[PDB]
Amino acid sequence: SLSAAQKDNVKSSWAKASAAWGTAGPEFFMALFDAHDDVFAKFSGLFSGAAKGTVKNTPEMAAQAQSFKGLVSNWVDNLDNAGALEGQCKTFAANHKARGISAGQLEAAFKVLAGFMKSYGGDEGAWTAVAGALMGMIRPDM
Ligand code: HEM
Numbered sequence: 689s690l691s692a693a694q695k696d697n698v699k700s701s702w703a704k705a706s707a708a709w710g711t712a713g714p715e716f717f718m719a720l721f722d723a724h725d726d727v728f729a730k731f732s733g734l735f736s737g738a739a740k741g742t743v744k745n746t747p748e749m750a751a752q753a754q755s756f757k758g759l760v761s762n763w764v765d766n767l768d769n770a771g772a773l774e775g776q777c778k779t780f781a782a783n784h785k786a787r788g789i790s791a792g793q794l795e796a797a798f799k800v801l802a803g804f805m806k807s808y809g810g811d812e813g814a815w816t817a818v819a820g821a822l823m824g825m826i827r828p829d830m
């Protein structure tokens with residue numbers, strides 16, 4: 689369910705997106721928010737009530753893009769290490785469950801990411817496989 693080649697593509701394309709994430713991360717979040725208004729709703733405290741169409745170039749968005757990246761980098765650096773991946777997922781799940789966030793909203797974010805990553809050489813099928821592996825760890829904890 690997760691080949692060596694898929695992992696390699698995810699790592700390498702993540703390196704490319706990560707290098708560009710100071711501009712690309714805000715764009716990914718806007719794609720996420722435009723596809724899933726309920727995802728944007730959970731950020732209404734961070735963005736202090738602001739409308740979606742205003743948030744891209746805020747300091748909060750720059751911080752959030754950094755937060756998201758740091759965890760995806762940790763996952764993608766450990767794709768042969770189920771135990772390390774589980775440990776990171778457990779923390780992530782607990783934090784997002786405590787916000788009232790569902791497993792399906794996390795899955796939506798992974799689906800938006802998998803397509804977004806096509807611009808960085810990503811194989812959407814590889815990002816789908818990695819997301820499926822992570823969701824299998826996450827779901828029991830949501
Ligand atoms: C799959 C992807 C995701 C990754 C990698 C990701 C990662 C992170 C990390 C590392 C943090 C900072 C640690 C913490 O407080 O938990 C964070 C914070 C947060 N995430 Fe996520 N997250 C994901 C999906 C989502 C989704 C789908 C939502 C909303 C429906 C969301 C809502 C939030 C909120 C509201 C914060 C706190 C913002 C704040 O400081 O006020 N996350 N996420």
Ligand SMILES: [C-]#N
Nearest residue numbers: 752753755756
């Ligand atoms: C969470 N971003």
